[PDB]
Each structure stands twice: as C-alpha cells, then as structure tokens.
Amino acid sequence: TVASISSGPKHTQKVPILTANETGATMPVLPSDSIETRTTYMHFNGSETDVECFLGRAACVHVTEIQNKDATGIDNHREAKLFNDWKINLSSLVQLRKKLELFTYVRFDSEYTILATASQPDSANYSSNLVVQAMYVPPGAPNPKEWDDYTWQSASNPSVFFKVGDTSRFSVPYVGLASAYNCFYDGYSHDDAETQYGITVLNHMGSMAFRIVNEHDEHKTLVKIRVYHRAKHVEAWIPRAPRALPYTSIGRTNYPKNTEPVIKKRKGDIKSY
C-alpha cells in the first residue's frame, strides 16, 4: 500500500488545498497536494485501531466486598454483605465508559472474568478454601434474599462456582433486546412527566449475585470480587464527540457543577509555542 506518492512542482488551476469546510466534508488532501513528495509505503495495516481491538480487551467494571461469616442472628444477608448483587453495567468505571461512548450503538458478545481475592484482617489461623458462587439473575428471576436461599439453586439461572484466589471465565452472547445496545438514549420509558430519562432496560444486561457457598469459620474472611469484561465480535455505529467532563451517574450524561476547565490554558498568548 502506497503512503505517499511521488509528486513534483505544481502550477495548476486545481487547488486541492482550497475548499469549503462549510460543506461539512473533509476533503482527502494529502502531503502530495501541499509539498513535493517522495514515494513511501505504509508497512502498516491499522490492526490495533479496529474496534474489536479498541473495545475488545478486558477491563474492571465492578468491585465488591463480601464476607464469609456466621449468618446466625442476621436478618438481611444482602446488607450484611453475606452476598452482594450487581446490576450489570459497563458505565460504572469511566475509562471503559469513555471508549464505548465514542459510539452511539454497540453490539458485542461479552466475556466475563471474575477474580475473587480473600483477606483476613483480623486474627486467623489459616486461609480458608472458599468457593464463590456467581449467579446471573436476569430481570424477572427471583433476586436472592438470603445467602443460602432457594434462589441460589439456579435450576435455570446460569451460575459459576470457583475457588477464591482463582478465577472464573465465561462468554455471554449479545443479550440486548434491540439489534444493538444503546450507549445513549434520548428518550423515556413512556410518556410521563416524572419518568427516567436516558435510563432504559434496553441496556439491562441483567444482574450478578455473589456469595461464598462455604459455611462460616471462626474468623471473618473478606472477599473482594473484581468483575472484568471483554467485548468480542464488536460492532459499533455512529461515532460521537469524546467525553470531556467527568461523569456523575451511570447511564446519564450528567457532569458536575463547578467542574474544572478541560481546555488546557496556554502559558502566554495565542502566538506562544
């Protein structure tokens, strides 16, 4: 593939350097149009700028603390952190969010990696060989209410069991109702004065509940679970203006009041280098 063609002096009524940007078109003007050029080759395919490479590597999306301890005399196992629930979203960790939000619609198969790591901050004699259950709870399915509820049975729900310290890895096909996920939704659930803007179930990947299936030991062991998401077979539409200001909420384009200027003010005038 040719990068630069050979081009000599130009004395022409065709002025490739003159155009009208008022047209909204970016004319493919080359160095060969402005200067005298030598022949060069690309030696480059552009493999790393493909959306599958750009959007298609693993990223931390969720981190959660859960405790394996005695469940006696506890009324809410979700809030005592015997299990925690995560409404699946890629909009909670901003670095990945910005990448996805370069586009309006994205259709990808997912590949999750869950890494559970234990810690016994208080007196412990040993490192317990805990097994975490990661349970996929799609909308409508009974969300677990107790750490050993009938829900965890997962007779129809997808579920993964893996040892703490070790990891789980499972693929998930594109689960969107539409032909693509909406990174942005300029609309409502219905025509209602108080209904939620932007937030829609078009992006309801589902939920993930995490428990340690082990019974309690005498010591408290804190398990920090980290969910990693990798997009595969990525298709992306409608490129957007990159995010400039920081986020405030999941699924909202909201930015903080009194936020700092993002355009990097010069030292000196417009003439400075």
Binding site: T23, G24, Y185, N254
Partner: protein, 256 residues
Amino acid sequence: CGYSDRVQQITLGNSTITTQEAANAVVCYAEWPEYLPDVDASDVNKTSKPDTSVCRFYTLDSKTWTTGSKGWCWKLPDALKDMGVFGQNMFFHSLGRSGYTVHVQCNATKFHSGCLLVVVIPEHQLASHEGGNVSVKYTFTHPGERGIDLSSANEVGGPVKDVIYNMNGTLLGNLLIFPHQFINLRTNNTATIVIPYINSVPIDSMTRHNNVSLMVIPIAPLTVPTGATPSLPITVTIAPMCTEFSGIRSKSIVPQ
C-alpha cells in the same frame, strides 16, 4: 457546460425550497432515507406510508441570532408533533419511523460576519444541570417547534445549557464528527442535512423517544456592519421523508 451547485431546489409534496447560496447538501453517513425492508421488520402490522401529505417542508418559527446568542436545539420527531398531518399520525400510532431533510436558513449581506454550526446528533441524551443522578423531565426534552434556547436560564428538572459542553459533557469542537454543515455568511446562507432513520430498532415510539437532535450553534459570533440591526433571523425548515407509521390506535396523551 455551465450551471451551479449553489443554486438548488428541493420539492417535497406541495412544498418547494429554493436556495441560491447553498453549500453542498449533507447526507448523514452517506445513507439516504428508505422505507423499512421485510428482513429488518419485527412488527407484523402493515405500515402506513403517508406519502405527500406528511412528506413536505414544515417551516419552524424563526429564531433571532444576536451577538450574545449561545445557540438552539430541536428534537425530532418532537419538533414536528404539531405540524399538520405528520403530528396527528405521530400521536395516533404506537410506532413511527422517519427520515428528515433539514434546511436551515440564515441570510445576510456581504458586510456581515458570523458562522453557524448546523449539526445533527443521533441520541442526543441531554445532561441535567443539577448533576448527580438527577433526570431531565419529559417536558423539557420535548419542547416542540419552540426547541431549546441554550441562551436561556436553567429550570428545575431542565437540561444543562452550556453550549460549550454540548449539553452532554462533550466539547463543542468535536461535534463535527456528527453530520454537520456551517452557515458561513460570507460563503453560505443555507445548510441542508438529509437524515436517514437512525435507531437500534427498525421502528420505535415517536412520542417517548427522539432519534435525532438538530443543533444550530453560533461559533464565530454575529458581527453586523455599523448602524445595522444587531440581529439576524434563523429559520429552520424540516421535511419528513420515507415516513412509516404502525399500530394505529387511540390518540396518545403526553405530558403538558
């Protein structure tokens, strides 16, 4: 062989737009608007294609461009909800699908200076000014032919109106990634942007959801000659095309 690309005529239905200072029309993503094909269709109901009774130019109430104007934003199909038969069909049907020919008009003398950015943003999800997880209320996102004036004050439950941040936390300079055209008064008096139907679904509710958002933003401020009225009218004219409606039904009631 002589003629001109600045002199254009668009005839849709019984409506005709002419321009003598046109910049080359933009066709968003090089894709012309088309009826939904059977291979992409989900809804089984035979779609009403209303032809020339709706596929015509509706001119929107003019805006006044001053030296201190920040800009204006319209939502589609929202802006055309009160426009003739299109609006009626919009409210009588559960599902709607439409492309648009947007035509923005701002004429001035050869002594005038200023540049408008006319840009079409698909899924222009607005940001609340209250920050946090505060929602933008239905009434503010669906203003109608009035649109949103970005020079105005904020309202409780209303959107953020700092044109610099595109009302969404992105920078103004980058809007050029979206299908856009400038009205540079020295060059151009009319922008035109043909919008196809852009959605993740083949057809959608026209009332609850706005597919695209038209923004007209002064970049280079209006500089009028000495002794002139420090104002120019900006007139927006929109024509639906390849419009489809499905699931006819009792007229939908919306807020306000």
